[PDB]
Design a binder for this molecule. Structure first.
Ligand SMILES: CCCCCCCCCCCCO[C@H]1O[C@H](CO)[C@@H](O[C@H]2O[C@H](CO)[C@@H](O)[C@H](O)[C@H]2O)[C@H](O)[C@H]1O
Ligand SMILES: CC1(C)CCC(C)(C)c2cc(/C(=N/O)c3ccc4cc(C(=O)O)ccc4c3)ccc21
Length: 235
């Protein structure tokens, strides 16, 4: 119980210090390809891919702040990050959804409308990602819950090629305990919030599967290779 409370605060702070909240960021816009969908706008892809690389690095930084993660083998650390990074990217961008304006906001404040998200690279995946974001809103998750859910997504023992899956399982246990404790304490009249949050992990895995399929077609549309940390994530 004191150790669990410290875990909650450590994970929450790790998330916040690697992921500014929508409220914190000074939004700015772009007028590129803003009113009609096109196969790909290469100026938007260049900016989007740069922001994706930066957030991958931030997710690695987050991961290394999770209690016990750096006690896993370096191979297992890398396997877990490769398996979960796109899931966590998807959760992160969808927490930055502003429904009144139909926009998502990146960590430098760049705020793209739905058509621009399409044109930056999401392409035919755009509306499914926005629908996931829309169905995240009624859970009204806070930053602590987003951070814990992210940690649960990452630290999971089912990933292929783990050396020490039991060790990974044991690290996940307190994160699950922490999320349930926190969520019920914050909103005791809404006891389905914890199971709803865990079911979002399945949704995220589905959308990340679709994102990996989109990466294959996108590669045929861009003038060079994808950035190297994106390629690490996709392998
Ligand atoms: C999921 C696919 C990835 C698989 C795992 C492999 C990725 C490994 C990433 C390690 C990143 C290297 O980290 C090293 O270089 C980064 C880039 O110059 C630095 O990153 C630093 O600057 C970045 C801006 O560029 C900031 O967002 C980081 O917060 C800051 O720490 C690190 O402080 C340094 O520790
Ligand atoms: C593999 C590749 C390149 C191509 C396929 C698609 C388009 C599905 C894709 C999507 C993402 C992505 N999906 O949400 C994402 C991107 C930037 C993000 C930036 C931030 C941020 O600044 O705080 C937060 C979340 C982000 C989340 C990343 C890579 C890719």
């Amino acid at each position: 119980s004191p150790q669990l409370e410290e875990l909650i605060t450590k994970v929450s702070k790790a998330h916040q210090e690697t992921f500014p909240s929508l409220c914190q960021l000074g939004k700015y816009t772009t007028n590129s390809s803003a009113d009609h969908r096109v196969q790909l706008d290469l100026g938007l892809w260049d900016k989007f891919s740069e922001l994706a690389t930066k957030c991958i690095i931030k997710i690695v930084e987050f991961a290394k702040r999770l209690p016990g993660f750096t006690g896993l083998s370096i191979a297992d650390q890398i396997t877990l990050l490769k398996a979960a990074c796109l899931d966590i990217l998807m959760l992160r961008i969808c927490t930055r959804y502003t429904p009144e304006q139909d926009t998502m906001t990146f960590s430098d404040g760049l705020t793209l409308n739905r058509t621009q998200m399409h044109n930056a690279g999401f392409g035919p995946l755009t509306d499914l990602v926005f629908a996931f974001a829309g169905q995240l809103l009624p859970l009204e998750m806070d930053d602590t819950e987003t951070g814990l859910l992210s940690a649960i997504c990452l630290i999971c023992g089912d990933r292929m090629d783990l050396e020490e899956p039991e060790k990974v399982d044991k690290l996940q246990e307190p994160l699950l305990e922490a999320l349930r404790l926190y969520a019920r304490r914050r909103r005791p009249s809404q006891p389905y919030m914890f199971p709803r949050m865990l079911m979002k992990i399945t949704d995220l895995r589905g959308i990340s599967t679709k994102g990996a399929e989109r990466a294959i077609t996108l590669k045929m549309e861009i003038p060079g290779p994808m950035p190297p940390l994106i390629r690490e994530m996709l392998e």
